[PDB]
Motif scaffolding. Structure first.
Motif, PDB file in Angstrom:
ATOM      1  N   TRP A 174      47.214  67.630 -27.689  1.00 32.21           N
ATOM      2  CA  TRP A 174      46.460  66.453 -28.450  1.00 32.21           C
ATOM      3  C   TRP A 174      47.796  65.337 -28.601  1.00 32.21           C
ATOM      4  CZ3 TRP A 174      45.028  70.493 -32.488  1.00 32.21           C
ATOM      5  CH2 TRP A 174      43.958  70.951 -32.053  1.00 32.21           C
TER       6      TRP A 174
ATOM      7  N   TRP B 198      49.383  69.127 -40.867  1.00 30.55           N
ATOM      8  CA  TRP B 198      49.397  69.327 -39.382  1.00 30.55           C
ATOM      9  C   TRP B 198      50.853  69.039 -38.866  1.00 30.55           C
ATOM     10  CZ3 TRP B 198      45.024  70.732 -37.137  1.00 30.55           C
ATOM     11  CH2 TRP B 198      43.796  70.360 -37.625  1.00 30.55           C
TER      12      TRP B 198
ATOM     13  N   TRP C 281      29.975  70.093 -28.688  1.00 29.77           N
ATOM     14  CA  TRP C 281      30.885  69.474 -29.714  1.00 29.77           C
ATOM     15  C   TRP C 281      30.587  68.026 -29.981  1.00 29.77           C
ATOM     16  CZ3 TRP C 281      32.755  70.932 -34.006  1.00 29.77           C
ATOM     17  CH2 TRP C 281      33.563  70.043 -34.908  1.00 29.77           C
ATOM     18  N   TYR C 282      30.898  67.310 -29.181  1.00 28.10           N
ATOM     19  CA  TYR C 282      30.848  65.750 -29.323  1.00 28.10           C
ATOM     20  C   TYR C 282      29.866  65.096 -29.411  1.00 28.10           C
ATOM     21  CZ  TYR C 282      35.782  66.620 -28.062  1.00 28.10           C
ATOM     22  OH  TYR C 282      37.213  66.997 -28.075  1.00 28.10           O
TER      23      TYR C 282
ATOM     24  N   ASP D 164      30.326  75.392 -28.570  1.00 29.14           N
ATOM     25  CA  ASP D 164      31.746  75.086 -29.431  1.00 29.14           C
ATOM     26  C   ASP D 164      31.545  75.701 -30.815  1.00 29.14           C
ATOM     27  OD1 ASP D 164      34.069  72.969 -29.872  1.00 29.14           O
ATOM     28  OD2 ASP D 164      33.925  73.185 -27.871  1.00 29.14           O
TER      29      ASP D 164
ATOM     30  N   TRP E 181      33.654  78.843 -27.616  1.00 23.61           N
ATOM     31  CA  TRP E 181      34.998  78.469 -28.020  1.00 23.61           C
ATOM     32  C   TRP E 181      35.418  79.353 -29.143  1.00 23.61           C
ATOM     33  CZ3 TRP E 181      35.926  77.522 -33.202  1.00 23.61           C
ATOM     34  CH2 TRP E 181      37.138  76.583 -33.478  1.00 23.61           C
TER      35      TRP E 181
ATOM     36  N   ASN F 179      42.574  73.077 -41.919  1.00 25.85           N
ATOM     37  CA  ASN F 179      41.244  72.451 -41.067  1.00 25.85           C
ATOM     38  C   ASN F 179      40.168  72.927 -41.865  1.00 25.85           C
ATOM     39  OD1 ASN F 179      40.087  70.890 -39.290  1.00 25.85           O
ATOM     40  ND2 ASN F 179      40.113  72.410 -37.800  1.00 25.85           N
ATOM     41  N   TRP F 180      38.878  72.463 -41.639  1.00 25.12           N
ATOM     42  CA  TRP F 180      37.866  72.889 -42.014  1.00 25.12           C
ATOM     43  C   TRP F 180      37.740  73.084 -43.688  1.00 25.12           C
ATOM     44  CZ3 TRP F 180      40.320  75.662 -38.233  1.00 25.12           C
ATOM     45  CH2 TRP F 180      39.712  75.457 -36.926  1.00 25.12           C
TER      46      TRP F 180
ATOM     47  N   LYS G  23      36.958  78.649 -24.159  1.00 25.12           N
ATOM     48  CA  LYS G  23      37.814  77.465 -24.591  1.00 25.12           C
ATOM     49  C   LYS G  23      38.598  78.027 -25.803  1.00 25.12           C
ATOM     50  CE  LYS G  23      37.312  72.811 -26.716  1.00 25.12           C
ATOM     51  NZ  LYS G  23      36.240  71.750 -26.986  1.00 25.12           N
TER      52      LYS G  23
ATOM     53  N   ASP H  56      41.495  77.339 -28.554  1.00 28.01           N
ATOM     54  CA  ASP H  56      41.638  76.192 -29.249  1.00 28.01           C
ATOM     55  C   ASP H  56      42.645  76.485 -30.300  1.00 28.01           C
ATOM     56  OD1 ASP H  56      41.856  73.436 -29.880  1.00 28.01           O
ATOM     57  OD2 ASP H  56      39.418  73.402 -30.264  1.00 28.01           O
ATOM     58  N   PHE H  57      43.221  75.504 -30.623  1.00 25.82           N
ATOM     59  CA  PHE H  57      44.576  75.525 -31.741  1.00 25.82           C
ATOM     60  C   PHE H  57      45.570  76.617 -31.609  1.00 25.82           C
ATOM     61  CE2 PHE H  57      42.469  72.707 -35.052  1.00 25.82           C
ATOM     62  CZ  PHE H  57      41.343  72.576 -34.561  1.00 25.82           C
TER      63      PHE H  57
ATOM     64  N   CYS I 190      43.488  74.828 -25.467  1.00 28.95           N
ATOM     65  CA  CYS I 190      43.121  73.564 -26.098  1.00 28.95           C
ATOM     66  C   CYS I 190      44.186  73.588 -27.363  1.00 28.95           C
ATOM     67  CB  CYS I 190      41.781  73.116 -26.472  1.00 28.95           C
ATOM     68  SG  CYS I 190      41.121  71.675 -27.274  1.00 28.95           S
TER      69      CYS I 190
ATOM     70  N   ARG J 144      43.413  71.289 -21.895  1.00 29.73           N
ATOM     71  CA  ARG J 144      43.211  70.110 -22.420  1.00 29.73           C
ATOM     72  C   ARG J 144      44.463  69.263 -22.549  1.00 29.73           C
ATOM     73  NH1 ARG J 144      39.530  68.978 -26.522  1.00 29.73           N
ATOM     74  NH2 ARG J 144      41.132  67.382 -26.875  1.00 29.73           N
TER      75      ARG J 144
ATOM     76  N   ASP K 270      41.214  64.412 -28.817  1.00 26.78           N
ATOM     77  CA  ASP K 270      39.932  64.325 -28.700  1.00 26.78           C
ATOM     78  C   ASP K 270      39.380  63.067 -28.220  1.00 26.78           C
ATOM     79  OD1 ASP K 270      40.215  67.252 -29.547  1.00 26.78           O
ATOM     80  OD2 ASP K 270      39.021  66.815 -31.523  1.00 26.78           O
TER      81      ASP K 270
ATOM     82  N   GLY L 197      46.847  60.790 -32.789  1.00 31.20           N
ATOM     83  CA  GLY L 197      46.056  62.010 -32.695  1.00 31.20           C
ATOM     84  C   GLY L 197      44.768  62.136 -33.286  1.00 31.20           C
TER      85      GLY L 197
HETATM   86  O1  LIG Z   1      36.820  72.157 -34.007  1.00 32.77           O
HETATM   87  C1  LIG Z   1      36.224  72.375 -32.734  1.00 32.77           C
HETATM   88  C2  LIG Z   1      37.211  70.975 -32.085  1.00 32.77           C
HETATM   89  C3  LIG Z   1      37.516  69.846 -33.062  1.00 32.77           C
HETATM   90  C4  LIG Z   1      38.655  70.898 -32.499  1.00 32.77           C
HETATM   91  C5  LIG Z   1      39.595  70.294 -31.531  1.00 32.77           C
HETATM   92  O2  LIG Z   1      39.847  68.985 -32.021  1.00 32.77           O
HETATM   93  C6  LIG Z   1      40.919  68.782 -32.831  1.00 32.77           C
HETATM   94  C7  LIG Z   1      41.927  68.317 -32.820  1.00 32.77           C
HETATM   95  C8  LIG Z   1      42.951  67.890 -33.560  1.00 32.77           C
HETATM   96  F1  LIG Z   1      44.489  67.448 -33.416  1.00 32.77           F
HETATM   97  C9  LIG Z   1      42.740  68.098 -34.844  1.00 32.77           C
HETATM   98  C10 LIG Z   1      41.487  68.773 -35.302  1.00 32.77           C
HETATM   99  F2  LIG Z   1      41.162  69.299 -36.530  1.00 32.77           F
HETATM  100  C11 LIG Z   1      40.510  69.155 -34.332  1.00 32.77           C
HETATM  101  C12 LIG Z   1      39.084  70.537 -30.053  1.00 32.77           C
HETATM  102  O3  LIG Z   1      40.178  69.895 -29.166  1.00 32.77           O
HETATM  103  C13 LIG Z   1      37.724  69.988 -29.999  1.00 32.77           C
HETATM  104  O4  LIG Z   1      37.298  69.808 -28.587  1.00 32.77           O
HETATM  105  C14 LIG Z   1      36.441  70.795 -30.507  1.00 32.77           C
HETATM  106  O5  LIG Z   1      36.695  72.099 -29.841  1.00 32.77           O
END
Ligand SMILES: OC[C@@]12C[C@@H]1[C@H](Oc1cc(F)cc(F)c1)[C@H](O)[C@@H](O)[C@H]2O
Ligand SMILES: [Mg+2]
Length: 534
Positions: A74, A94, A199-200, A229, A266, A299-300, A334, A336-337, A377, A392, A396, A409
């Motif tokens: 990101w 963050w 998601w979007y 997602d 996801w 988050n959340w 996918k 993520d985090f 991601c 990714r 976003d 970001g």
């Molecule tokens: O919670 C699902 C979600 C939002 C998270 C993620 O996007 C984020 C990117 C961030 F820098 C911070 C955040 F809280 C979310 C990710 O990049 C998105 O595509 C989607 O999958």
């Protein structure tokens, strides 16, 4: 073959630069390194033992204008003025997305893995043990390998560093990336997935009822993957427990597969929230600070902890989870985090956060097998090369351009696209680049037809992954036309010709697409493009 004046001015492991083989026996560590000539420049490689700590690898005068890169998906890859840099205020929720070494960033300009100027790339070929980064410290550019206070009884390999010079800066960046792909055995799939993502359009408010509606409509679109997602899960960590109107995770896969798609899902697999069942059962499974669970991010509206990937119990839980998903029929993941898995802190084994991170993703790969597609991601970039199939590479996107969104970001189509451009050279070298989803609907959006076109056609010229995220009821003739013509632009070798631009206008070529040789000129301030196809 004389030495440039600027090359004689460079220090490698504290010594005047020159070719050769060297040994630095320092107080608490030893390094053995070679400086060798390669095509377009030099390579510094070798091995280290002891407690190298924050190890200085290279020092040289800072250039005025530098292309800087954040460690993870990101964060920005962008050109900065190195002398007028102001430390940012970092969001305490963050911290680690901004930097894995935040003491650096709050003081000095920081670039992770590589940095560039006009004519010159400095870049590390791997991140397997140390985190490699550059800082501008009082007018000087200093390359470092961070070992996070880990001690090594016997030698381990240095992360190699290349210094490349040529007036064609995009060529250097592409060469750097081909060297990274060789060093890490990058996965470059021969087929690129198309698909749908929830998601979007729906965000956390996706219902399984809306999912089923889109599942039916998706039969009219050129989608291979149907990916669910964030929304379906009861809590962060509890990936096989659903909420709301969703059926079981296994049942979702079966319905999706019965409708003729590859099921995708996801997860945030290195994250466990403070409320999750997994955390409340296993308080011992997370990274710690002064013996207590260390928040990785918020988050959340919850504190989120990081799994300690040095623990075999944790790695078995990950294996079983992803093995259980594979059995269900998921073949697109996918994940993520992922930065959470690499946060600094206390782990059960005295290994680096990067060593921990790599054991976790390697476990996931083993569990899903060679026939599953892994999309990374929110992830550290270099450590994931060789494991993920797609990644990714920007912040976003969003169903708006983001006129009032700063480059920090937060979601915005304009900044998501900028990173797809500035990181373009990773594509088909590190992995498949994922520029984030196309948003082609014509209601419930503030994007114009021209903004949709600009985003989508730039992604096609770049040969990037093309995944759509819309309420497919709201996608009509124009959105279908944009998707069709986008997919016609795939299949080439792209180059961003003026990668050091500071005014957000870019000239981009791609040779050998399904439409021949193509060229797009895009201007992210005016929101205009001009596309030519041969
Ligand atoms: O919670 C699902 C979600 C939002 C998270 C993620 O996007 C984020 C990117 C961030 F820098 C911070 C955040 F809280 C979310 C990710 O990049 C998105 O595509 C989607 O999958
Ligand atoms: Mg390709």
């Amino acid at each position: 073959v004389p030495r440039g004046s600027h090359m004689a001015s460079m220090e490698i492991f504290g010594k005047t630069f020159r070719e050769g083989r060297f040994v630095l026996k320092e107080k608490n560590f030893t390094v053995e390194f070679a400086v060798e000539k390669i095509h377009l420049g030099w390579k510094i490689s070798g091995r280290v033992k002891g407690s190298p700590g924050r190890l200085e690898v290279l020092r040289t005068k800072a250039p005025e204008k530098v292309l800087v890169n954040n460690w993870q998906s990101w964060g920005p890859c962008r050109v900065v003025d190195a002398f007028s840099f102001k430390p940012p205020e970092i969001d305490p929720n963050w911290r680690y997305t901004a930097s894995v070494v935040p003491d650096v960033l709050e003081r000095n300009l920081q670039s992770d893995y590589f940095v560039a100027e006009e004519g010159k790339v400095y870049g590390f070929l791997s991140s397997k043990i140390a985190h490699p980064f550059f800082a501008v410290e009082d007018g000087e550019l200093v390359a470092y390998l961070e070992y996070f206070d880990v001690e090594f009884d016997d030698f381990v390999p240095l992360e190699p560093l290349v210094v490349l010079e040529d007036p064609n800066t995009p060529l250097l960046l592409e060469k750097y990336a081909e060297l990274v792909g060789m060093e890490n055995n990058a996965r470059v799939p021969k087929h690129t997935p198309t698909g749908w993502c929830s998601w979007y359009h729906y965000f956390l408010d996706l219902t399984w009822e809306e999912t089923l509606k889109n599942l039916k409509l998706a039969k009219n679109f050129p989608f291979e993957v149907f990916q669910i997602d964030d929304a379906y899960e009861k809590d962060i960590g509890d990936w096989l427990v659903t909420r709301g109107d969703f059926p079981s995770v296994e049942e979702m896969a079966k319905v999706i597969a019965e409708n003729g798609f590859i099921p995708g899902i996801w997860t945030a697999p290195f994250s466990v929230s403070e409320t999750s069942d997994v955390f409340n059962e296993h308080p011992d499974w997370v990274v710690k600070e002064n013996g207590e669970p260390k928040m990785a991010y918020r988050n959340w509206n919850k504190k989120i902890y990081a799994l300690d990937l040095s623990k075999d119990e944790v790695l078995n839980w990950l294996f079983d989870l992803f093995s259980s998903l594979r059995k269900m029929g998921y073949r697109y993941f996918k994940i993520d985090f992922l930065f959470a898995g690499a946060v600094p802190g206390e782990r059960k084994k005295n290994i680096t956060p990067i060593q921990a991170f790599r054991k976790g993703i390697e476990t996931i790969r083993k569990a899903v097998g060679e026939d599953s597609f892994i999309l990374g991601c929110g992830s550290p970039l270099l450590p994931a090369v060789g494991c993920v199939d797609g990644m990714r590479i920007g912040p976003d996107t969003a169903p708006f351009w983001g006129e009032h969104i700063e480059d920090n970001g937060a979601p915005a189509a304009r900044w998501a696209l900028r990173n797809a451009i500035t990181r373009y050279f990773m594509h088909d070298r590190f992995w498949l680049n994922d520029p984030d989803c196309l948003i082609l609907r014509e209601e419930k959006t503030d994007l114009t037809q021209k903004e949709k076109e600009l985003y989508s056609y730039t992604c096609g010229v770049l040969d990037n992954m093309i995944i759509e995220s819309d309420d497919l009821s709201l996608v009509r003739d124009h959105g279908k036309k944009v998707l069709k013509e986008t997919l016609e632009l795939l299949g080439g070798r792209p180059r961003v010709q003026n990668i050091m631009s500071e005014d957000l206008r870019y000239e981009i070529v791609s040779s050998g697409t399904l439409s021949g040789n193509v060229k797009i000129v895009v201007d992210l301030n005016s929101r205009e493009y001009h596309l030519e196809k041969e």
